[PDB]
Amino acid sequence: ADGNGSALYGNNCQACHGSITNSDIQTRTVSAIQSAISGNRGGMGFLSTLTSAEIQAIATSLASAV
Ligand code: HEC
């Protein structure tokens, strides 16, 4: 689906990290995102609801922005 990663990021990340083209995230990988969720960095533990496909789509979009 065109726009999936950016839409996911806008709904789940942007409130705390900025818009995707101006994001403050450093490590734009699935493992980095999953580690932050698991460690509840910034309260992100609630994002356990994301599938692995969705985290992939977010990380790909972030890495492409950039
Ligand atoms: C506020 C409730 C947040 C939401 C929603 C998301 N993030 Fe987050 N994240 C937040 C904080 C306060 C921190 C810690 C920064 C610090 O000073 O330690 C983080 C951490 C990350 C990280 C690791 C740090 C980095 O590489 O920049 C990543 C990779 C990350 N967060 C990604 C991320 C994603 C993909 C989100 C949407 C699924 C997301 N965060 C939401 C605060 C909040």
Residue numbers in the entry: 1 to 66
Question: What does the publication say?
Answer:
PgcA has been shown to play an important role in EET but is unusual in containing three CXXCH heme binding motifs that are separated by repeated (PT)x motifs, suggested to enhance binding to mineral surfaces. The amino acid sequence of PgcA contains a cleavable Sec signal peptide followed by an N‐terminal lipid anchor and four domains interspersed by repeated (PT)x motifs. Furthermore, we demonstrate a distinct role for its domain III as a mineral reductase that is recharged by domains I and II. These findings show PgcA to be the first of a new class of electron transfer proteins, with redox centers separated by some nanometers but tethered together by flexible linkers, facilitating electron transfer through a tethered diffusion mechanism rather than a fixed, closely packed electron transfer chain.
The 1.8 Å crystal structure of heme domain II consisted of six copies of the protein within the asymmetric unit, comprising residues 352–414 of the PgcA amino acid sequence. The overall fold is the same within each copy and consists of four loop‐linked α‐helices encapsulating the c‐type heme moiety. Like domain I, domain II displays His‐Met heme ligation (in this case from residues His365 and Met392) and the imidazole groups of His365 are within H‐bonding distance (2.7 Å) of the carboxylate group of Asp372. Domains I and II possess two acidic residues, Glu281 and Asp372, which hydrogen bond the proximal histidine of the His–Met coordinated heme. From domain III to domain I to domain II, the spectra have increasingly anisotropic signatures where the g max value becomes more intense than the other two g‐values (De & Albracht, 1979) (g max = 3.23 and 3.37 for domain I and II, respectively). A highly anisotropic or axial LS (HALS) type “large g max” signal (g > 3.2) can occur when two histidine heme ligands are perpendicular to each other but is also typical of histidine–methionine heme coordination where ligand orientation cannot be resolved (Zoppellaro et al., 2009).
